[PDB]
């Protein structure tokens, strides 16, 4: 067309290459709904290959009926958001064996990498907490060779989440620390996960003034408020 | 250079006909650093266990913290649903703009 | 002639689209585990009403992946679906 | 590939719980255009202001766009006429200066019978303009605040 | 059409806006200023009869506002016309008083640059567009957002309300736009048919027809009932 | 031009009132100190756990949890215009002649449509634009009841309005002002149950190197 001055000084090998490319070089996927589906689903390792079948039968590793139970028992661990404490060795072990059965590893998880994970979490959270601590205060006795007590708030762990933003996993956790950690003053934070409803301002409904005792849906939410 | 005019054809293939001069230079100096880091980490991962799955491990090691994440719509939908539980607060009814309380505004501050 | 060569070069550049070899889907631990837990409760609760088969494996009873022991670097795999 | 999408839509409605007549009527409702609302920018004859009721908006209590067709307190309803006659030093100024008094008096006497605090707003809002024109009658109308005060 | 042409801006003036009564113009610069022009040649100093001092300064009938640390990509005027709302690439939206020329409130709820701020019809609460593929509903008295509008594939470019202030319209760079319920947060309409990033959207004062323009130079109108 | 006059309901109370005298979708039971989530006709019975304490936060907010969508498609239950009807039985406050029956509605989200599409992606293998077109068509056919009608704008009709219906800044003296705002654990130390001798043998060997039985007996008597 009009690019004779530019498409010509490409060499003959380059042009003979670039008159051949097409769509259909891959075996990939690109539908992002389907990528999120395959990242969501739990997958169990199966066997069809005969050499790997005799390799997994020799080392006394079991059939997929045990790896599916191991998936379920690695998922059923009380993960550390619910327990409000750093996890222990059995929780680490069960979660890591469930993850290793998710990825395909049908072997055994070593007992020293759990302690390695423990020290990794130690130094990770110590780095984050230290570079939040030395920003609310200038420790004059430290950082030198010759006031009171402060509590770090969630706004501070958002404020030094960005002044030193390299310190994070950049996964979901930093997204929720940026997106949902800051609360407006009508947020009703000290709660029981349900009392921010509109009907808890408008009067507990009483009971059983009826022969058939079918009730209304504004009473069912008061029933579920108690639990 | 061959890749300056190849970047000219790449930019023109996505309908970018006006740009400056140092923009393919910046694209080439990005691609050099990215490929050098990827191949160095892949040489590490091949001394550990070159091949294509080695390159896949070396570019999955650094996908996790720099470029645009993949299919983030369902996590954002979950996060939106956690934020859109709370009903909207009571608004003023005096047809104007209401400020926050005075300590939450950039006025009672000092230098 | 340079004209057919130039138009076929521009035909070649107009057909090449790259995909990435490794893309890490932005997700969570907690929403994945809570999705699994709620799906396990409501999958163990009801029945299937099959034509010939039900989905799931031992103690899953839902749509479960079929990743092989080998080919762990594959991008897609089969799932379980109730077949009549 | 649009007929296959139509079939996927029909099977989705069938599995998500829409009756055959209900799905046919929702399709026919989806196809026809939004008809004309004759009060389209809310013309100032049959249109009202939005309520200032200190609640956030809510798109419920609302019917469909497919179907065919589509209190106001005294102080603003007097201030409209007040500004309309106040924007004129024309040939018709002092006749409006004449007729502005008894409409205010009758609105005040019809508003003390319903809402007393709105009436106390309405009296002292438009008090000091014609005191020199109408004497101590507005001073006599200080002590009216209820139905029995009339 | 009365055309306001700005002269000595060396390609470093982003999108501008005029107030209502057309007395103030606001232009966001690439070097983190907001420039405020009195379009009538007025004083724009708001003396208010105080007259204390300082005729020694240079007032070229134009005030500069320095509160941002990134480039200002959008700017919106209140219908009250007394406040200005400037959205930047530093991850804040700031509020300015147009009668003392200072900043009042910083609004931090984004982690990517802000591209389109827009007040409500009644001036109650403003919606925001950003690079993180989500729009956010705010309020001028709350520091942090109130709703998150998520569901687009690419980032949100333009934002606009319905003229009653009851729905939100967001257009995005994945060749589509959406209508969002302002209370429940979830999308009510998805309009497909474009072939380029939707860049400006506007809904008619009737309210039954939506119009938007893309970067392909094609405007198109849908009706919100049928959606086609 | 529309052809008929249509009557479509997009609330909770109106859809529930329309769909009384109909068979329910779920069947939830509140017994004493334990619960049961069954089908309308092996259905599980739960202890006070944390999956149920998060499911109960999705019934005081009447929306379906996003996790359940695919398995609802598996379990052949009846949907009602995208919603499903939870019938709760409180047995603690029963009456004599039947427990206290509630009948609430749960409403779909954007998450439920996304998870329905992600579970459609298992056996269909569609692209992204087919999901876009499918979502647009369903958001057309199922989201009626739009409040698209504009009132008067109070900022242009300022001359015919009360003066203090607006709030602008005012200048005070030298400033200006806006508007703001033990023993039991000791006595059971070795109380660990063992199912069988073989399991005890395996448990002591590897350290140095439900009613399934009745169901099996029943199915073996059936097979003969």
CSV table of N, CA, C and O in Angstrom, one decimal, chain B residues 71 73-74 77-78 80-82 84-86 92-102 105, chain F residues 58 61 63 66 109-111 114-115 118 132 135 154-155 161 164-167 178-181:
chain,number,residue,atom,x,y,z
B,71,UNK,N,-8.2,-12.4,34.7
B,71,UNK,CA,-9.6,-12.6,35.0
B,71,UNK,C,-10.0,-12.1,36.4
B,71,UNK,O,-10.5,-12.8,37.3
B,73,UNK,N,-12.4,-10.3,37.4
B,73,UNK,CA,-13.8,-9.9,37.5
B,73,UNK,C,-14.5,-10.6,38.7
B,73,UNK,O,-15.4,-10.0,39.3
B,74,UNK,N,-14.2,-11.9,38.9
B,74,UNK,CA,-15.0,-12.6,40.0
B,74,UNK,C,-14.5,-12.2,41.4
B,74,UNK,O,-15.3,-12.1,42.3
B,77,UNK,N,-16.1,-8.9,41.8
B,77,UNK,CA,-17.5,-9.1,42.1
B,77,UNK,C,-17.8,-9.5,43.5
B,77,UNK,O,-18.7,-9.0,44.2
B,78,UNK,N,-16.9,-10.4,44.1
B,78,UNK,CA,-17.0,-10.8,45.5
B,78,UNK,C,-16.8,-9.7,46.4
B,78,UNK,O,-17.5,-9.4,47.4
B,80,UNK,N,-17.0,-6.4,45.7
B,80,UNK,CA,-18.2,-5.5,45.5
B,80,UNK,C,-19.4,-6.0,46.3
B,80,UNK,O,-20.0,-5.2,47.0
B,81,UNK,N,-19.6,-7.3,46.3
B,81,UNK,CA,-20.7,-7.8,47.1
B,81,UNK,C,-20.5,-7.7,48.6
B,81,UNK,O,-21.4,-7.6,49.4
B,82,UNK,N,-19.2,-7.7,49.0
B,82,UNK,CA,-18.9,-7.4,50.4
B,82,UNK,C,-19.1,-6.0,50.8
B,82,UNK,O,-19.5,-5.6,51.9
B,84,UNK,N,-21.3,-3.8,49.0
B,84,UNK,CA,-22.6,-3.5,48.7
B,84,UNK,C,-23.6,-4.3,49.6
B,84,UNK,O,-24.8,-4.5,49.2
B,85,UNK,N,-23.2,-4.8,50.7
B,85,UNK,CA,-24.1,-5.3,51.7
B,85,UNK,C,-24.8,-4.1,52.5
B,85,UNK,O,-26.0,-4.1,52.7
B,86,UNK,N,-23.9,-3.2,52.9
B,86,UNK,CA,-24.4,-2.0,53.7
B,86,UNK,C,-25.3,-1.2,52.8
B,86,UNK,O,-24.9,-0.7,51.7
B,92,UNK,N,-28.3,14.5,53.5
B,92,UNK,CA,-28.9,15.7,53.8
B,92,UNK,C,-30.1,16.0,52.8
B,92,UNK,O,-30.1,15.5,51.7
B,93,UNK,N,-31.0,16.8,53.3
B,93,UNK,CA,-32.1,17.2,52.5
B,93,UNK,C,-32.2,18.7,52.3
B,93,UNK,O,-33.4,19.2,52.3
B,94,UNK,N,-31.1,19.3,52.2
B,94,UNK,CA,-31.1,20.8,52.1
B,94,UNK,C,-30.4,21.2,50.8
B,94,UNK,O,-29.9,22.3,50.6
B,95,UNK,N,-30.4,20.3,49.8
B,95,UNK,CA,-30.0,20.5,48.4
B,95,UNK,C,-28.7,21.2,48.2
B,95,UNK,O,-28.6,22.3,47.6
B,96,UNK,N,-27.6,20.6,48.7
B,96,UNK,CA,-26.3,21.2,48.6
B,96,UNK,C,-25.2,20.2,48.7
B,96,UNK,O,-25.5,19.0,48.4
B,97,UNK,N,-24.1,20.6,49.2
B,97,UNK,CA,-22.9,19.7,49.4
B,97,UNK,C,-22.6,19.8,50.9
B,97,UNK,O,-22.3,20.9,51.4
B,98,UNK,N,-22.6,18.7,51.5
B,98,UNK,CA,-22.2,18.6,52.9
B,98,UNK,C,-20.8,18.0,53.1
B,98,UNK,O,-20.5,17.1,52.4
B,99,UNK,N,-20.1,18.6,54.0
B,99,UNK,CA,-18.7,18.2,54.2
B,99,UNK,C,-18.6,17.2,55.3
B,99,UNK,O,-19.6,16.9,56.0
B,100,UNK,N,-17.5,16.5,55.4
B,100,UNK,CA,-17.3,15.6,56.6
B,100,UNK,C,-17.1,16.4,57.9
B,100,UNK,O,-17.0,17.7,57.8
B,101,UNK,N,-17.0,15.8,59.0
B,101,UNK,CA,-16.6,16.5,60.3
B,101,UNK,C,-15.2,17.1,60.1
B,101,UNK,O,-14.4,16.7,59.3
B,102,UNK,N,-15.0,18.1,61.0
B,102,UNK,CA,-13.9,19.1,60.8
B,102,UNK,C,-12.5,18.4,61.0
B,102,UNK,O,-11.6,18.9,60.4
B,105,UNK,N,-11.3,16.8,57.6
B,105,UNK,CA,-11.1,17.7,56.5
B,105,UNK,C,-9.8,18.4,56.6
B,105,UNK,O,-9.2,18.5,57.7
F,58,UNK,N,-26.7,-15.0,54.8
F,58,UNK,CA,-27.3,-14.8,53.4
F,58,UNK,C,-28.8,-15.1,53.4
F,58,UNK,O,-29.3,-15.3,52.3
F,61,UNK,N,-30.1,-11.4,54.7
F,61,UNK,CA,-30.0,-10.6,53.5
F,61,UNK,C,-30.4,-11.5,52.4
F,61,UNK,O,-29.7,-12.4,52.0
F,63,UNK,N,-30.5,-13.0,49.6
F,63,UNK,CA,-29.8,-13.3,48.4
F,63,UNK,C,-29.2,-14.7,48.4
F,63,UNK,O,-28.9,-15.2,49.5
F,66,UNK,N,-23.3,-17.3,46.3
F,66,UNK,CA,-22.7,-17.5,45.0
F,66,UNK,C,-22.2,-18.9,44.8
F,66,UNK,O,-22.0,-19.3,43.6
F,109,UNK,N,-27.8,-12.3,42.4
F,109,UNK,CA,-26.8,-11.2,42.3
F,109,UNK,C,-26.2,-11.2,41.0
F,109,UNK,O,-26.5,-12.0,40.1
F,110,UNK,N,-25.2,-10.3,40.8
F,110,UNK,CA,-24.3,-10.4,39.7
F,110,UNK,C,-23.3,-11.6,39.9
F,110,UNK,O,-22.9,-12.3,38.9
F,111,UNK,N,-23.0,-12.0,41.1
F,111,UNK,CA,-22.2,-13.1,41.4
F,111,UNK,C,-22.9,-14.4,41.0
F,111,UNK,O,-22.2,-15.4,40.6
F,114,UNK,N,-22.5,-14.7,37.3
F,114,UNK,CA,-21.2,-15.0,36.9
F,114,UNK,C,-20.8,-16.5,37.2
F,114,UNK,O,-20.1,-17.1,36.4
F,115,UNK,N,-21.3,-17.0,38.4
F,115,UNK,CA,-21.0,-18.4,38.7
F,115,UNK,C,-21.8,-19.3,37.9
F,115,UNK,O,-21.4,-20.4,37.5
F,118,UNK,N,-19.8,-19.4,34.7
F,118,UNK,CA,-18.6,-20.2,34.9
F,118,UNK,C,-18.9,-21.7,35.0
F,118,UNK,O,-18.0,-22.5,34.5
F,132,UNK,N,-21.0,-12.3,27.0
F,132,UNK,CA,-21.5,-10.9,27.0
F,132,UNK,C,-22.9,-10.8,26.4
F,132,UNK,O,-23.7,-10.1,27.0
F,135,UNK,N,-25.5,-12.5,28.7
F,135,UNK,CA,-25.8,-11.7,29.9
F,135,UNK,C,-26.6,-10.5,29.5
F,135,UNK,O,-27.5,-10.1,30.3
F,154,UNK,N,-34.2,21.5,40.8
F,154,UNK,CA,-34.4,22.6,41.6
F,154,UNK,C,-33.4,23.7,41.4
F,154,UNK,O,-33.6,24.8,42.0
F,155,UNK,N,-32.3,23.5,40.6
F,155,UNK,CA,-31.3,24.5,40.5
F,155,UNK,C,-31.5,25.5,39.4
F,155,UNK,O,-30.9,26.6,39.4
F,161,UNK,N,-39.1,29.0,44.3
F,161,UNK,CA,-38.7,28.1,45.3
F,161,UNK,C,-38.4,28.9,46.6
F,161,UNK,O,-38.1,30.1,46.5
F,164,UNK,N,-34.4,29.1,51.6
F,164,UNK,CA,-33.5,28.3,52.4
F,164,UNK,C,-33.7,26.8,52.1
F,164,UNK,O,-33.6,26.0,53.1
F,165,UNK,N,-34.0,26.4,50.9
F,165,UNK,CA,-34.0,25.0,50.5
F,165,UNK,C,-32.6,24.7,50.0
F,165,UNK,O,-32.4,23.5,49.7
F,166,UNK,N,-31.7,25.6,49.9
F,166,UNK,CA,-30.4,25.4,49.4
F,166,UNK,C,-29.4,25.7,50.6
F,166,UNK,O,-29.7,26.4,51.5
F,167,UNK,N,-28.2,25.2,50.5
F,167,UNK,CA,-27.1,25.4,51.5
F,167,UNK,C,-25.8,25.8,50.7
F,167,UNK,O,-25.1,24.9,50.3
F,178,UNK,N,-18.7,26.4,56.1
F,178,UNK,CA,-19.5,25.4,55.3
F,178,UNK,C,-20.3,24.6,56.3
F,178,UNK,O,-20.4,24.9,57.5
F,179,UNK,N,-21.1,23.7,55.7
F,179,UNK,CA,-21.9,22.7,56.5
F,179,UNK,C,-21.2,21.4,56.6
F,179,UNK,O,-20.6,20.9,55.6
F,180,UNK,N,-21.1,20.8,57.8
F,180,UNK,CA,-20.3,19.6,58.0
F,180,UNK,C,-21.2,18.4,58.4
F,180,UNK,O,-22.4,18.5,58.4
F,181,UNK,N,-20.6,17.3,58.7
F,181,UNK,CA,-21.2,16.0,59.2
F,181,UNK,C,-22.2,15.5,58.1
F,181,UNK,O,-22.3,14.2,58.0
